[PDB]
Amino acid sequence: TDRVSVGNLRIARVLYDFVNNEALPGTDIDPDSFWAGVDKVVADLTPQNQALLNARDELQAQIDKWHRRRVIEPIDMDAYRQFLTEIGYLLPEPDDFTITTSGVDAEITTTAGPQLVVPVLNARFALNAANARWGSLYDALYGTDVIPETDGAEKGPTYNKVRGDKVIAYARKFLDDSVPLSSGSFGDATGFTVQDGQLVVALPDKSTGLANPGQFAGYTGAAESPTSVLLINHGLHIEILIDPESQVGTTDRAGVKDVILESAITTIMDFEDSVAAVDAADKVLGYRNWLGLNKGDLAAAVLRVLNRDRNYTAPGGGQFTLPGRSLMFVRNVGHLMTNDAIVDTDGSEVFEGIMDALFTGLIAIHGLKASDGPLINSRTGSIYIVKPKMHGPAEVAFTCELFSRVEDVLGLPQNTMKIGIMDEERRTTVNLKACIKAAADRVVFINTGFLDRTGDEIHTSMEAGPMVRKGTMKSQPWILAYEDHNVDAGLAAGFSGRAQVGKGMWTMTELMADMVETKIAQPRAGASTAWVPSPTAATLHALHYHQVDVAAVQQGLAGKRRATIEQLLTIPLAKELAWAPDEIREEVDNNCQSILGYVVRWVDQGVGASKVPDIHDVALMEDRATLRISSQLLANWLRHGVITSADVRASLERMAPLVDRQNAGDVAYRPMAPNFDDSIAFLAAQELILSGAQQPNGYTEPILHRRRREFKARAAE
Ligand SMILES: O=C(O)CCSc1ccc(Cl)cc1
Numbered sequence: 001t002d003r004v005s006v007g008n009l010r011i012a013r014v015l016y017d018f019v020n021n022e023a024l025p026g027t028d029i030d031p032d033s034f035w036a037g038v039d040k041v042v043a044d045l046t047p048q049n050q051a052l053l054n055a056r057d058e059l060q061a062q063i064d065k066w067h068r069r070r071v072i073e074p075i076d077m078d079a080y081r082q083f084l085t086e087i088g089y090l091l092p093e094p095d096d097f098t099i100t101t102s103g104v105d106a107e108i109t110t111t112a113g114p115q116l117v118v119p120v121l122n123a124r125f126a127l128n129a130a131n132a133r134w135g136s137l138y139d140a141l142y143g144t145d146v147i148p149e150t151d152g153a154e155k156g157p158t159y160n161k162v163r164g165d166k167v168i169a170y171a172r173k174f175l176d177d178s179v180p181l182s183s184g185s186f187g188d189a190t191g192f193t194v195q196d197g198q199l200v201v202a203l204p205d206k207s208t209g210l211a212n213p214g215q216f217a218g219y220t221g222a223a224e225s226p227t228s229v230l231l232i233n234h235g236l237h238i239e240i241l242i243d244p245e246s247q248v249g250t251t252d253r254a255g256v257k258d259v260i261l262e263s264a265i266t267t268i269m270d271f272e273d274s275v276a277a278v279d280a281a282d283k284v285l286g287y288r289n290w291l292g293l294n295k296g297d298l299a300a301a302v303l304r305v306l307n308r309d310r311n312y313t314a315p316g317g318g319q320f321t322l323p324g325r326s327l328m329f330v331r332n333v334g335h336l337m338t339n340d341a342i343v344d345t346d347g348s349e350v351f352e353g354i355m356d357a358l359f360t361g362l363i364a365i366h367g368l369k370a371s372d373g374p375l376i377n378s379r380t381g382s383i384y385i386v387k388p389k390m391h392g393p394a395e396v397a398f399t400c401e402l403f404s405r406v407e408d409v410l411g412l413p414q415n416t417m418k419i420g421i422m423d424e425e426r427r428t429t430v431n432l433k434a435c436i437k438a439a440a441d442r443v444v445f446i447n448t449g450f451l452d453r454t455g456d457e458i459h460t461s462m463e464a465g466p467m468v469r470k471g472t473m474k475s476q477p478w479i480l481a482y483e484d485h486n487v488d489a490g491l492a493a494g495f496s497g498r499a500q501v502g503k504g505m506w507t508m509t510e511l512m513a514d515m516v517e518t519k520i521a522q523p524r525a526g527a528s529t530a531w532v533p534s535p536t537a538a539t540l541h542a543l544h545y546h547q548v549d550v551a552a553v554q555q556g557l558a559g560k561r562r563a564t565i566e567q568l569l570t571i572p573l574a575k576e577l578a579w580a581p582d583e584i585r586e587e588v589d590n591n592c593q594s595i596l597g598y599v600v601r602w603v604d605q606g607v608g609a610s611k612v613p614d615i616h617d618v619a620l621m622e623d624r625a626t627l628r629i630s631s632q633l634l635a636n637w638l639r640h641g642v643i644t645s646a647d648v649r650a651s652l653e654r655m656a657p658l659v660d661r662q663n664a665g666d667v668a669y670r671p672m673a674p675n676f677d678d679s680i681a682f683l684a685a686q687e688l689i690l691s692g693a694q695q696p697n698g699y700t701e702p703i704l705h706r707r708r709r710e711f712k713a714r715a716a717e
């Protein structure tokens with residue numbers, strides 16, 4: 001065929017060529033040695049990879065049987081826990097330890113703030129995310145509902161001064177709250193000067209300095225009329241841009257044009273659940289963008305490029321620089337899937353996670369070298385890889401061994417390849433300390449991946465009985481315990497000042513007032529970072545890190561244990577007679593709509609993340625984990641007789657045209673209705689639900705990938 005032979009491997013040519021021509025030059029890695037390394041690591045680690053996947057299946061079969069064999073109404077927690085221990089699911093917790101991970105950048109070890117996640121196959125989005133380190137607070141306030149569109153203050157086609165004024169006043173208050181003046185308010189400022197290394201703020205009847213002069217980090221322009229003033233609070237920078245010759249500056253009492261906030265200080269470039277990549281061509285598109293980001297030369301159509309560092313004058317008068325870019329992680333795929341980018345002599349596809357480590361690892365070397373500017377990414381010499389969907393410490397150890405072996409192939413120092421552990425599978429949750437210990441010399445974060453975690457929750461106890469509704473899951477005892485337990489594990493392992501303790505995505509992209517009002521819970525909970533779906537939401541979530549002293553919050557949580565194993569293990573079973581018929585129908589429609597809405601963009605257009613209108617037309621930006629949840633929940637309800645297979649069909653058929661109409665503003669869209677059996681997307685949605693109970697841990701990829709490939713093939717013939 002078209003493939004390249006390397007040992008027992010047959011490498012898709014598009015991949016072979018990309019690596020030889022694009023990825024390898026400049027890494028000083030001998031191309032032949034590299035490919036021999038690929039062959040050898042794949043040969044050596046494939047059996048253990050398959051062994052771990054089989055173990056998941058066996059543990060799940062035993063749990064299914066445990067539930068099927070009993071008919072008591074309340075779960076005997078003591079017996080359940082004993083059983084889980086006996087089968088090797090719940091492992092002993094190791095003695096206290098402190099992570100030793102080193103060579104990590106300050107953005108990760110020290111700085112608390114928002115973290116962006118973006119699909120790596122979308123070059124423009126990736127570039128926007130990387131540039132989102134600094135963002136306009138005025139743009140974020142004016143452009144969203146954080147400033148209400150009440151009478152007189154609504155967005156028009158052109159600039160509304162009443163709205164602009166609300167924006168200005170909101171930000172003045174932020175300034176008062178974050179970097180307080182000794183006396184008076186920023187709301188009454190008339191100017192800013194730097195005198196003998198001190199920030200002086202002019203008021204009407206007097207002048208004043210900062211309550212804490214140390215929050216003054218610098219400025220631009222002349223000290224006697226700066227163009228901007230740089231502040232710092234809780235390690236995050238705040239920049240006041242001064243220019244009366246600007247749209248809003250002319251209206252402003254101190255000539256202030258904008259307030260820029262340091263926002264997304266880290267960004268995860270995603271190869272997993274926000275992208276649709278099912279063959280060699282898709283992986284190469286992803287790898288090519290990852291390469292462009294690391295070499296610093298990625299450029300997208302509508303011409304977008306990466307930002308340079310930002311130049312400042314220190315308070316004393318000396319010069320310095322700050323990073324202009326969000327520090328990048330890459331999220332590899334997990335241990336499950338294979339991909340035909342490489343097959344063996346049998347035609348057997350190679351594990352995609354192994355490939356990701358080799359290739360995203362190889363590619364990240366460019367981020368440690370000069371960009372033809374200074375190097376793009378890690379100044380401390382680390383490569384940062386988020387690893388999703390791991391179950392238990394053995395799976396964590398395997399990943400670490402994979403990274404070690406890749407480090408050899410790449411001629412990299414051991415432990416160069418750091419690991420962001422997603423805690424989004426129940427067997428990881430209940431063995432979290434052990435998972436951290438397995439990666440104690442590589443771990444740079446843990447994060448509560450809650451949509452996925454809920455999917456795993458449902459699949460794991462699928463045989464136990466009907467689960468509560470999807471909307472109910474977010475407030476269930478198990479998940480609230482999971483959230484605290486994650487923080488507790490991290491802090492006890494010494495994450496404070498060493499590694500990120502992260503929480504999940506705000507998915508409601510247009511509900512920013514709600515985000516600002518409520519997402520503050522996450523840093524109040526001791527999280528040094530949390531996920532936001534866009535640069536705009538990053539700028540807004542930043543506010544939370546100014547109001548909350550995360551470092552202090554973490555210090556106060558030290559040595560506390562706020563969740564028991566019993567709480568973690570509390571299965572979200574719905575109570576008897578929980579739902580009226582109408583509520584059941586709502587929930588079915590809800591879930592069928594969320595499956596159809598997402599699947600149709602995935603299968604038809606290879607889009608894995610977008611603003612998808614939900615059943616109530618609320619814009620949600622969710623990755624593939626939303627599919628895992630909805631399909632598992634419906635499968636759970638079908639399994640326990642809450643709904644019939646005709647209910648599912650009727651809902652699918654009822655919701656399909658609604659999704660069709662929701663996609664009206666898209667020229668590439670093909671209506672699913674009314675020829676359902678001719679729509680691969682519709683059939684994919686159906687299959688995910690009807691085959692849901694039989695998918696390993698409820699994973700949707702084997703079905704989704706097959707259907708997407710099916711669509712790709714039909715579109716060519
Ligand atoms: O990882 C999980 O389990 C859920 C993460 S939610 C998410 C939404 C959107 C994008 Cl672009 C990325 C992630």
Ligand SMILES: [Mg+2]
Pocket residue numbers: 273388389424449452625
């Ligand atoms: Mg996930």
